[PDB]
Amino acid sequence: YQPTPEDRFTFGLWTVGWQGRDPFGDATRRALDPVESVRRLAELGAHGVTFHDDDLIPFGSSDSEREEHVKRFRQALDDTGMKVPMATTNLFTHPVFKDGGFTANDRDVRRYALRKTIRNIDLAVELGAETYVAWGGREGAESGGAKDVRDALDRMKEAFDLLGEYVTSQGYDIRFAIEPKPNEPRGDILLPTVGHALAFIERLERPELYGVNPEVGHEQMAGLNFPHGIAQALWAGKLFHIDLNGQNGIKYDQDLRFGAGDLRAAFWLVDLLESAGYSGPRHFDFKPPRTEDFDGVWASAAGCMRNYLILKERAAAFRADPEVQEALRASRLDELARPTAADGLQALLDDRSAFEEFDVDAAAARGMAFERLDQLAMDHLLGA
Amino acid sequence: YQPTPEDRFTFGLWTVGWQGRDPFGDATRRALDPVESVRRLAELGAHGVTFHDDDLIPFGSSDSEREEHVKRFRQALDDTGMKVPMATTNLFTHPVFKDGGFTANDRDVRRYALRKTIRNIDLAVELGAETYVAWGGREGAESGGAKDVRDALDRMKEAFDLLGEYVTSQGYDIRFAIEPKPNEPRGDILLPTVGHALAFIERLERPELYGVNPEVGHEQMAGLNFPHGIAQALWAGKLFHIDLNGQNGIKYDQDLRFGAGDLRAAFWLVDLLESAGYSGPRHFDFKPPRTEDFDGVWASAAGCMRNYLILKERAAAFRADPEVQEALRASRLDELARPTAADGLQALLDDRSAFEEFDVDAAAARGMAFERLDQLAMDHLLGA
Amino acid sequence: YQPTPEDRFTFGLWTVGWQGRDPFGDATRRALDPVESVRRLAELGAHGVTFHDDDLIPFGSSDSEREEHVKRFRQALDDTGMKVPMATTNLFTHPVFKDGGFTANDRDVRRYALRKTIRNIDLAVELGAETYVAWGGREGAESGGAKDVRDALDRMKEAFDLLGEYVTSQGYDIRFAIEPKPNEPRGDILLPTVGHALAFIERLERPELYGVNPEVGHEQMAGLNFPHGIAQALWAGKLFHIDLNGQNGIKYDQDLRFGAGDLRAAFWLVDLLESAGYSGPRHFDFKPPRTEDFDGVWASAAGCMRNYLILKERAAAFRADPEVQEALRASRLDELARPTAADGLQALLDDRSAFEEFDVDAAAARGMAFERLDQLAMDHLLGA
Amino acid sequence: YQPTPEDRFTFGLWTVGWQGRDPFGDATRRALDPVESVRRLAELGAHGVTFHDDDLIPFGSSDSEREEHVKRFRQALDDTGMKVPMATTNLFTHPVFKDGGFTANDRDVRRYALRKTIRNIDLAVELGAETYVAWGGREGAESGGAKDVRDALDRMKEAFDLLGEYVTSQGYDIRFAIEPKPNEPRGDILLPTVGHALAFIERLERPELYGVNPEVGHEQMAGLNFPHGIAQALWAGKLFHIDLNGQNGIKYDQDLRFGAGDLRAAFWLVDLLESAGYSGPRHFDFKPPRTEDFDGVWASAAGCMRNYLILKERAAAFRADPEVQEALRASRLDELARPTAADGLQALLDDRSAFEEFDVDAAAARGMAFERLDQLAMDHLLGA
Ligand SMILES: [Mg+2]
Ligand SMILES: [Mg+2]
Ligand SMILES: [Mg+2]
Ligand SMILES: [Mg+2]
Ligand SMILES: [Mg+2]
Ligand SMILES: [Mg+2]
Ligand SMILES: [Mg+2]
Ligand SMILES: [Mg+2]
Fold first, then answer.
1. Where along the chain is Mg(2+) 2 bound (chains A, B, C, D)?
2. Any CB–CB contact under 8 A between C326 and chain B?
3. C 159-178 → D contacts, CB under 8 A
4. C359 noted as active-site residue
5. Which of A175, B244, B381, C93 could be joined to B258 by an S-S link, Cβ 3.0–4.6 Å?
6. B260 at the C interface (CB within 8 A)?
7. Strand runs labelled E in B124-209
């Protein structure tokens, strides 16, 4: 279980470098240097990093302070063989975003929110990122009257339209991925589930430009099955990226290491990507708990990497045992892949074995046999 | 607060006629006669009824028992002046649906599930219903391996495709409305929120044929703001129907009377339909609690009707007070309706007042003034 | 609805003075002066203030800086006629409390946590507070192995034992009130509900010294009926204090103004204190949302005060209408106050009308008539 | 992983014999014979059974039909070597309990509720049960006005007082265990958590007579850590029984097999009983999902038994590795067992190393090292 760069594991600068400041208390570690965060991840076995625009360059820095920061960061990229596959904008930390960016009430703020996104699109294309993740963390409200949603759904689309026009005119070969979250920091946020995000995308002037970035924890916060959100996304060709962490149920976004929270969910999820052929970057968006020092930090992401490598093993072993392969056929998982009525509407309607001569009592007695399967994946997951 | 038939209030046969049998205990009232449920609602002030196909005719009845039941029910419709605007299929109560209908694993069941839907489409068109609500109550799973979702999203669409072909060929002038629910009876169900349902619809061969039937309680079960789900639906032209009840948070579907559960949510919701021009049937899908007798029953739906008539009054009064109308302008609710960049991408990008000469500290200090508004709707809602 | 000081309304220095810094973003208002927070509340109609020990005096201040701060604050108390009925310790903001105070793993921290509590007990007795609220905000864990609970329940009791010994020896005439919260900032916290807190209290060497400080929002976070927690407390003589705010369900502690969140819950709660004779300080522990300026601030607490004064009116009107008073008797609310078996075990057991000659079908048909009552309190709450 | 009768595993007649009837649909299996449920469990390796009083004898049976049923059941007990360690009363299924038993409003019902409990106490003492579990499933309300809680807390205690007097006078050597649940079937139920139940117990005239029966699923429904509820119970000497199943979060009581739902919670729980010396009956209160036939049934409880036997192995292996034993000492789990101030209040207060000469910055930098531990139990749980 030593991760290789060919696993394409990415981490974020913000995730290992989180200083442990929480809504109630102060930061228990000092600020890292992005140079030192790059070298270190290449000595654990990771494959790339990802950053918001305030990560790499501090807010308000002068254009010569900007490039020096970019030159250092680049030199590190050239000193580790590590890439930057995804990049993103910080639209949430400055008090001028307190009511959002793209959906902020005030008109003058929305324009600035757009200009600060485009300026980081040019940086991420230069550092070669193939994905561009957008999380409206401040879009939504705390009170039913504060945000008229239909207008707020009108200004979102606008800005994401403009983002699609900026990239077409420039010749940039990059795609957007919206990241949803139902609440926190806002009491409600717009486009809450992965499903809501798919709905909004189909209404943009160029639907082939935008996917979704889902997160394990963000969907489990609404009590929602994640490997089930991850199938709908693959089913409409819209899994562009995915965020790997752990979460213990409906509550504040804990952002635990991947492996924690719900382990059977992390199992069935790794099963689904490997067997459906997801070739994107396994990104960990998480938070090493604030109790730990720096030694607890680097042990934490080694976990992320090491837990995925174990389930992928138990996932493949589950799918290679000919006792499971029979167990699948006894629940009739194969008929679920065959068409219901390939013979056509008229044949169906003419078929008397489907209604008038159908034995509803002999069908209803057939046992689905789901509980001996679920234990064979229980056996395969615990290795007993 | 006497409801008039011009309010278009509908109830369901199943809702007043619920016998009070719960997952743990037995039925505390005896079965009603659909004739007696029709006369009675016309003496409270309601405008129509709605039914599943097992409501009006018992399951398995012979075709002469079917028409006699239809003839009685019709004679009542002719003896009250009441209509049937929406109708729906019972795909959940018989044990042959234990794993669903349209998404049931077995192939022979899915065909039957389709045939039992079409046969009730012909009844509802004869009784003149304009809407046809579909609630996959048994679609979903309890275990991560039991339902491959991408296949299950393939067989849904199929059947809803076939339903759209059956209605086009026949000349029927009716539309479908999917009704979502995140769980119960199944531990998870497919297409959980109103947003998921909008996503699935755009992928059917005829997108102008299907809307959503939302329910207050079904979305509040996932901790989701309902007057916010009700705006996204209006914003894509897909509010075909709506179900009115009450619910106290994330838990088993209580199905309380409209007015209970969350009253401010019921306030902001009635505000939104009246000010956006919803002309559909105000349907109450609810359950008079099983403790009550028949006298408690008829008092219960009188509540439903009487609580909507009060909020519509407090909603209009809130929107007519020129102190509110000023209060809206002080939060800048008017600029939220104006475009962000009608002058065009190039102008925005050339405008130095939007970035380089923008005063971020003087904007961030402007107070949104949300809390004096929210009390004026507090004042308007309690009438003090 | 002008609040009078005889309403005994208290606010906290920390609540109006919250600077709007959240887990994701920066503070949108500047720091208040406790002098200016005192004068202002006396011009709205409030009756007292309450403070943590880091509020009034900054952490680490020298003993001459301490008394000057106390002298200023006192002079204000003498310049408004306002009292300080409750006081409390800040055990959560400094990084030396990251794992708790009384339950912190390390031994040297626990002693310091005790010394910093006693030193503020002497201040609050000097400023005359009658209650001393204790919220272990940092007690609990994020991981099943980090905190052995039985030991952690052993060190709590210890420190609360020592607190009871310090006050008995000194002659102080003050009582403690534990404040529970199920999670946040910690993912789980110890003694989560009001019920857990009552359980822990009975095990201290002096049970007549400790009550509970409950909070509306803290119990609604676990999906729990608050006017029902507020009855169990009164029923064992342990409602020493209560915190008034609002909360929209299970999620991060919003701390909305009293009146928001759940209004029917705030109704039935004000009903319960007024009709049971609670004579304690109506304290508002809340957070004016960070979008507002200072003008939005002072409007916010005026709400708190003004919403309580409205429900107390609708609560009394509900309890004075002889149609309600009959409505209570028809549900048999009076027999619920009579004893089940005052005649004694032997009589009960000899009574053949209670078993062998009991008509179970004629009892089960009697209607509890709950839904016509609930609308009369609906009518009384909306005033229609 | 073959369970032996010396594991003391009990099942309930009602759990394997659940017919699969749910709040929305009909029963997918036929009724078992309690004789056939007894023989079968003795061929899987279980140690006893448990029953409600309507299980073994149908409601209303004549006293000769009662004893014949008891004689058959007994003959089976004599034909398997299996015991009946716990028994319980069905106070929830008949419509005369729709508003509760002990807390039912009506006076005549409460007396009957008491008489039907005592009559089953005499049966369970004859069949030799050592525990007597009581679940007020119908105690609570759906509406804030329907149940005055303080009175309702007065009639509970009464009946549980009377139950304690009936057993003292008779010479019965048996103890009660209250079983809590926050909601369902009622929207709220009284004494919701394990903590609330401990609080109610200390107020009965004979506190050494009543413990708590906790259930994994019942506490996880309120989002509450179960191995943490299971420590508070052991810490006050009040773990008399425990119910083993699985549950996926806050929602309707799924009652999955032990092993499902939250596996790390089931891990840390088996860890806690084995290392604290719980000698009671490992009872499975669960529901084989209704999709299965009878073959899926018996595979299901074999799981329950087989999953506990695996964690007890991984739990012991985790606690025997001297790399863990060092890992415990590095988080300072040993100082958490030492007293904070065994030297006494006066010494603490005189100790200048605990306040005035205390290095708060060198303590706050010490890393708790929680994340390398949690992975060693991750390694020990997955066996990698
Ligand atoms: Mg995150
Ligand atoms: Mg994320
Ligand atoms: Mg319903
Ligand atoms: Mg509905
Ligand atoms: Mg608070
Ligand atoms: Mg508080
Ligand atoms: Mg159960
Ligand atoms: Mg149970």
1. 215, 218, 253, 255
2. no
3. 159, 162, 165-166
4. no
5. B244
6. yes
7. 131-134, 140-141, 175-178, 188-189
Residue type for position A201: I
Report the greatest alpha carbon distance in chain D. 81
Buried b vs exposed e over D235-269: b needs ≥16 C-beta within 10 Å? Answer: bbebbbbbbbbbbbbbbbbbbbbbbbbbbbbbbbb
End-to-end CA distance of chain C: 19
Yes or no, beta carbons of C98 and A25 under 8 Å apart: yes
A-chain residues within 8 Å CB-CB of C23?
22-23, 184-185, 252
Closest CA to A346 of B114, B60, B102: B114
Solved how? X-ray
Tokens of A72: 């250092």
Q: How far apart are CA B185 and CA B137, in angstroms?
A: 7
User: Which residue reads 């066996």 in tokens?
Assistant: D383
Q: Compute the distance between CA of residue B227 and CA of residue B220 in angstroms, rounded to an integer.
A: 10
Pairwise CA distance, residues B49 & B13, whole Å: 6
List, as one string, the DSSP characters of D267-309: HHHHHHHHHHT--S-EEE-----TT--HHHHHHHHHHHHHHHH
**CB within 8 Å of D25: residues ≥ 6 apart:** B92, B93, B94, B95, B97, B98, B138, B185, D290
> Would the CB atoms of C95 and A25 count as touching at under 8 Å?
yes
Rounded Cα distance between A77 and A13, Å, is 13
Q: One-letter amino acid identity for D277?
A: G
Q: Say whether residue B223 is in contact with chain A using an 8 A CB cutoff.
A: yes
Residues of chain C contacting B259 with CB distance shorter than 8 Å? 378
E strands present in chain C: 9-12, 48-50, 86-88, 131-134, 140-141, 175-178, 188-189, 210-212, 242-243, 282-284
Enumerate domains of chain C plus CATH numbers.
5-315 (3.20.20.150), 322-382 (no CATH)
Q: Of B339, C9, B192, C144, whose CA–CA distance to A225 is shortest?
A: B192
**CA–CA dist D66, D63 (Å, integer):** 5
End-to-end CA distance of chain B: 19
- What's the CA dihedral at C347, C352, C356, C362 to 10 degrees? -110
Distance, CA of A219 to CA of A231 (rounded, Å): 13
Please give, rounded to a whole number of angstroms, the shortest distance from the CA of B382 to a CA of chain C. Answer: 5
C-beta separation of A212 from A201 below 8 A? yes
Q: Which of D53, D54, D55, D271 is catalytic?
A: D55
Chain A residue closest to B362 (CA)?
A: A96
* Cis bond before residue B185 (omega within 30° of 0): yes
Tell me the CA–centroid distance for residue C285 and ligand 7, in Å: 38
Instruction: Give contacts of A303 with chain D, Cβ < 8 Å.
Output: 371, 375, 378
**What residues contact residue C190 under an 8 Å CB cut-off, 6+ apart?**
C103, C136, C139, C140, C149, C152, C153, C156
d(CA C143, CA A288): 13
Best of D149, D346, D355, D376 to disrupt the C interface (most C CBs within 10 Å) is: D149
Residue of C15, C332, C360, C382 for testing the chain B interface, max B β-carbons within 10 Å? C382
Q: Which letter, b or e, does each residue of A196-228 get, where b requires 16 or more Cβ atoms within 10 Å of its Cβ? A: bbbbbbbbbeeeebbbbbbbbbbbbbbbbbbbb
Beta pairing class for B188-189 and B140-141: antiparallel
Pairing, β D282-284 against β B140-141: unpaired
Secondary structure class of C208 (helix, strand, coil): helix
With b for 16 or more beta-carbon neighbours within 10 A and e for fewer, the C126-157 pattern comes to: ebebbbbbbbbbbbbbbbbbbbbbbbbbbbbb
Backbone angles phi, psi at C373, to 5 degrees: -60, -55
Q: Which two tokens stand for residue A202?
A: 């189909």
Three-class secondary structure of residue A328 per DSSP: helix
**Token pair listed for A317:** 């072993």
Nearest CA among D243, D211, D238 for reference residue D226: D243
Resolution (A): 1.7
Please tell me the distance in Å from A95's CA to the nearest CA on chain C. 6
